[PDB]
């Protein structure tokens, strides 16, 4: 339920409020409040404090960037209480060492990548040009061109001198190093002519395209021989530096984040000229620790824990879930949506009340339940390993508390799933082709089943009736909660709207079961007339022109409950057809392909279960969020968020 | 059965098929604009699913008429 | 209408352009070698003589030949979509006409570059005492600028605050038209351009202390009004907050030239992703932006060979 | 036991399932197109995208339910 | 089966044909956006592959209806 | 045979024909995006060929159902 | 077929501004009169049946 | 239906450059296995009739 | 079908200029020959029976 | 099918201004001749039956 | 179906310039050959009747 | 269906250039081969009937 979130007023000195802010950040269980304009200053405390906070924030950003360059991640742990100068001295040394090592490793990798392409070509060009490199007669433009279209480039060389303008490729058969040697200026004009024919000389980077080709190939072979050992040494040094300094950087960044959060929270204070005001909101379940922290002031400097506002107009005040531990695990799926208006109803119990009972009616396969039990054992072993739920495939990093809540929800769902699957009387599709443990009236072999789930002459009508009954009960619960919240918030429009929607739905269901359903339309004729009159009376008392579309939308939300029975029967029919085809082509085909046919049928059934059960389990919670939330509103102002001080640890 | 049962079943099947065709036709552009608003903002999901599931009433009425036909069957 | 009939000639024009190796060959020239290299180019089809003015007129004529036909050869919704591509020079000419109507300069005072429609509309809008009548004379059926002028026209007659609010409403109407079409990639490129333009005008008007809600527009995805206020305040942390978005390299920079160059590079990388939509119009906008960057680089090489500018001064331009 | 109404009921259930899958694919075209566009935009909203992708299967489920009703009442 | 078998085969054929038509109708825009994402990068190929594989459930249901018609032929 | 084999051939033909119709409906956008990606880069031939040939399973299932009908005919 | 473009433009307008939720809802629900008239025709048919 | 978009993209690629016209024609001729299977089915039906 | 896109382009031209209303109305009413031939075929069918 | 594009272009022209509202209404109502022809054909067919 | 895009592009060309009205009318009248062939086949069928 | 896009692109080219009439007319008249094959099959049927 929505907690109190009661207010907390406090008055202190400037430095005493700094101490009390450090206390209330260590006791970080109260969201803050500015309240600056009410006859006080804005607590622009000090530009020296602003500069020290900027220095600590730069230290924290440098610690984050140093963990990033070292490869470490933002792993929260206990802080390191030390001076800011000592923190800078600890941080900047390893940060500078890692930055220099990373720059050297990137430069060595770029040098190796550049040397991997022009090692053999520059060496071949220098080998052909072993005496003609830099003597001041003629340039030799080597162009790394394509395969043997050497006459298309040599057209310009034939336009040049006869027994010279040697434009050919002696070696480097992959990328043909077409050396063209004519002159200096005449070969520059011929290089312009070859570029007009389409050409590009080997203007390499570094010292390769900035020195003579013999020294270029020599430095290329030298860098090629030096790059691998230097890159491996840089990788080993980076790994050793990260493994040696990651814990110190993490503790330093934790203390830096703590002090920076203290500075940013003290920025949101209210100072009173060597006095200071403080305003917060904290839940009722932590009032004792708040009073114990407030007693730890200078002389318990004058504060008060005052009450929060009522159901009317609590806008900036946040709320909380506050569920029991048997129902606490659905709080994540509850918080996937928005928050309530601190007086709006918490429908989080309806999730654990209705979603597993619907999912067990959907998933009646006890082999799928055993696979879910094995997957829950795997998730329980992963949570016992206490690692982060890390999947680089999905790029999903989830907390271990999230995995534990998911495992608890999976166990609570698997209980009702096994219950309704034994009520369905089906296991792994159908092992009943071999071992008919669920007895049928058509095939009496063992103890009976409640619903055979392959029969539909009576089971389908009863299943549709039970699903429609559960859905109409949930719709009536949503309309009743809407009218109750309209009465509790003193909003008679919402209460009259819920009453009129309930009366219209009751009259519509009565008229349906009278005219289109069974006989004896006399006892319910006045009931349908009363439902129509109640809808018309609430329309007249509302006068909001809430037309027939709202009633038809409520009718569709009620009728959506048969989709659960449809999905359960569809999954059951698919699993029964798959198990029947496997049993036929395994046992009825000689009973010798029992193992191979059973394995192929199990692979196909696992693929079909992975393809279908995700959407099948998704549609229950989707229909629940579509029906119960929208019948209760749940899209009005989205609540206010509870954000106390961190003490991130 | 006879001959009228199969013809009524054929008509109910064509009804359900064309109603699902119209429902998917509405849901295509509905979910297109909804996923566009979802990529625009994550705070619009509270009405996106409502506007998406607003078109299922035709499928619900077609299922009601098909159940009336199966009762007539 | 047909996003393939014009796209065939658009792919033909994408095959016929000057590469970045032609600009790297223009990195060492003295406007004669550069004039000969540009004379072989498509601007050589418009290169009358020599000089920076003849080369600039040649580049402008080549751009008007390449992109002015894109306003033609189309009709209907795709015509309106291509009309919501080259909205820079048309809005510049409209703002120049508004400044001439509110300033008192003569009708021949404006140089009147190629906008989106015929210049006879601007000639008739020179003698236009009524700004709503001027917008009605300038009212094309797919011109949303006339719609924005009519929307902001019920504020004043000819004011500069009216001009700024009309520019904001023109960006808003462009965003509404981009949302109102069946092209999510062009809408995403327009939204990225609008967010970068909001960041650019906010960083230019940073430190003014003015109303950011009067400056920030609606439609941005990578930044909000809180992000815009934190960027307009003296803090590059909001600029450091742009993580994962298209402003990837934009981190820890407070300048205007380097930030604008990075924004242009990010917009060029976003338009460079437009090759995935063959049957749409993103290839046409990619070719338009590539021709814009190429003509800007050609004019930059022309001015560099004119005033003897350093290649190190132009080395920050050759990456895009 | 009519040898003509059974084939007509089978034809009706087949037309129901086929046009239900047709409308489901018609919705899923734009659904998966916008979902893959959002996935290329960001690898952070896969859950609601997959939820919107799987939301159209209720029509195919209702068509399979009516087809199973036709198979039972054959 | 002289009158029931041919009509049931015609209905199962219409089922499988309309199901494959709708599957290709999904796969057109699905593979278009997936090929655009593959031209963007190769890092998210698995998500696009899963999105393309999501269309196979309707074809599986159509093949199941065809197998039901074959078992009831 | 007669009307049974004739309507069975009609159903198998309608299944195979609309299966090829759905395969071509997917392959239109598939080949358009694939030719756009090939014109963008020649290094995207194999993954685009896999994405283009992935839609053949519908026509394969239609051919298998037609072969089952021919074994039943 | 009506509700496709209707709900698309309505969701676009709701993403623009949530203040026109009722007007966009009325614009989306205006096409249901055809389904209501078809239901009335089917009711007249079932009464004839 | 395949060949419409296929030939549109192939003619656009050929108008872009006549360098990958062979792979474009290969992608154009790739929409033929459905017609091949239909011709085989028609031949088997002619042999079965 | 013929009237749809032709009248949409004609209404766009009327939004462009109201002086070509006669040519736009002529281009809009040019598709009535199909309705005339359909009425002629219907009269021929009524005369045949 | 005619009135879809007709009313779309007319709604765009009306959202521009009300300068040609009656002309846009006439251009939208231009497609009712086929409806009148179908109604007359239905009257003639009811007279035959 | 042909005359839809034909009349749309012709009205677009007419909104571009009124000088090309004759070639637009020729391109519009180019598509009546299938309608004339259908009328001739209907006359041949009525002769068979 | 062919002649819709054919005449649209041809009228766009004719509004672009009056000298582009001949090859566009050839490409527009290219779409009659399927109608010729259908008329040949119809003549074979009328000879059979």
Curated annotation (Swiss-Prot), chain C:
Q: Which InterPro entries match?
A: ATPase_csu/dsu_sf, ATPase_V0-cplx_csu, ATPase_V0-cplx_csu/dsu, V-ATPase_V0D/AC39_subunit, V-type_ATPase_csu/dsu, V-type_ATPase_csu/dsu_dom_3
Give the function comment from the record: Produces ATP from ADP in the presence of a proton gradient across the membrane.
What highest taxon heads this organism's lineage? Answer: Bacteria
Among HAMAP family, the record links this protein to:
ATP_synth_C_arch
Give the record's keywords alphabetically: ATP synthesis, Hydrogen ion transport, Ion transport, Transport
Cystine bridges? none
The record's comment on protein family reads: Belongs to the V-ATPase V0D/AC39 subunit family.
Query: Which molecular-function annotation in GO is an example for this chain?
Result: ATP binding
- Designated gene of the protein: atpC
Protein name per its UniProtKB record: V-type ATP synthase subunit C
Biological processes per GO annotation: proton motive force-driven plasma membrane ATP synthesis
Listed GO cellular component terms? proton-transporting V-type ATPase, V0 domain
